[PDB]
Amino acid sequence: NAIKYLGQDYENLRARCLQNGVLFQDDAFPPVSHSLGFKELGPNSSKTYGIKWKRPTELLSNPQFIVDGATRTDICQGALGDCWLLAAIASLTLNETILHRVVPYGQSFQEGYAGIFHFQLWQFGEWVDVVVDDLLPTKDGKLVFVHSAQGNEFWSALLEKAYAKVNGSYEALSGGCTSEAFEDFTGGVTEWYDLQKAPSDLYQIILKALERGSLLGCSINISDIRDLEAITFKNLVRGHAYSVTDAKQVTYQGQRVNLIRMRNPWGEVEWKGPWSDNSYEWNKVDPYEREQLRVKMEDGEFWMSFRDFIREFTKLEICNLT
Ligand SMILES: *[C@@H](C(=O)OCC)[C@H](O)C(=O)N[C@@H](CCC#N)C(=O)N[C@@H](CCCNC(=N)N)C(=O)N[C@@H](Cc1c[nH]c2ccccc12)C(N)=O
Ligand SMILES: [Ca+2]
Ligand SMILES: [Ca+2]
Secondary structure, three states: OOEEHHHOOHHHHHHHHHHOOOOOOOOOOOOOHHHHOOOOOOOOOHHHHOOEEEOHHHHOOOOEOOOOOOOHHHOEOOOOOOHHHHHHHHHHOOOHHHHHHHOOOOOOOOOOOOOEEEEEEEEOOEEEEEEEEOOEEEEOOEEOOOEOOOOOEOHHHHHHHHHHHHHOOOHHHOOOOHHHHHHHHHOOEEEEEEHHHOOOOHHHHHHHHHHOOOEEEEEOOOOOOOOOOOEOOOOOEOOOOEEEEEEEEEEEOOEEEEEEEEEOOOOOOOOOOOOOOOOHHHHHOOHHHHHHHOOOOOOOEEEEEHHHHHHHOOEEEEEEOO
């Protein structure tokens, strides 16, 4: 059983707000500018100025915590450089058991709702329960930071807020490493791989990691500053954490080709090379494999050949649990 961050007690807080006819306002991470940030998001800044804190129950008549499951399409990055965190959360959803440890069951905007939610994280060398109120940064009635592809779904916005809380502010989350969020959700062991010096069995390692629910992300180093744009000629984003979400093998003109699937935590903007959604390659696999694996949809998620992956990306991170 998780210990309470700062001694804040989810169930006692929720019950007492319900008894006293109020919704929770979190003294530890309150709905003010200092919870946004200190410089790029400080009181005196252009980003800060239009932001208003609103509850999902003030935005919409029927907000839902989880809609059609907690899945990686619910992770669409907003105007914060927390790609590393969101790639980790998207990966987290592929392992149901670890997912529902971080995101406890039973939380809702209906029965028993009192403006408070809770999540569990590996922090300070402990499993910790972190509460948040549901006041969220919004602009023109829309979430400014992470949101789901379902506009009425809130669990992922609330998780990102809890993760900001432990680090001090949303701005504190700008720039990071995927392995750090992997740890904070698992307490497990991170390893990284230099894709330019990949071992010969690297596809096997990936397949076995995916089989056992380990979390995998990848990224392209910006090796000359930002000197070709962030976006490459083949539509890949440099210095940007991607989630690795599958590895599967296809028969391409009678030969097996090893494929790998990743998702941009933007929820949009995809590889436009071979095995991309509209690439010709899919014309030349057998119909069944094609219809099991290809999804023509701008969802941020796409296939590469493993050969292309290891040429295009520079780093892979794997967090293995027990
Ligand atoms: C990603 C993002 O939000 O996309 C925007 C839409 C976000 O900018 C991000 O996390 N960037 C990372 C690189 C990509 C990843 N993950 C980043 O800026 N720095 C980390 C580098 C990881 C390895 N990079 C690549 N393979 N490309 C990093 O090490 N960050 C630091 C934290 C830090 C402290 N001060 C600065 C200043 C600039 C950048 C980062 C930092 C860390 N030790 O964790
Ligand atoms: Ca969902
Ligand atoms: Ca896609």
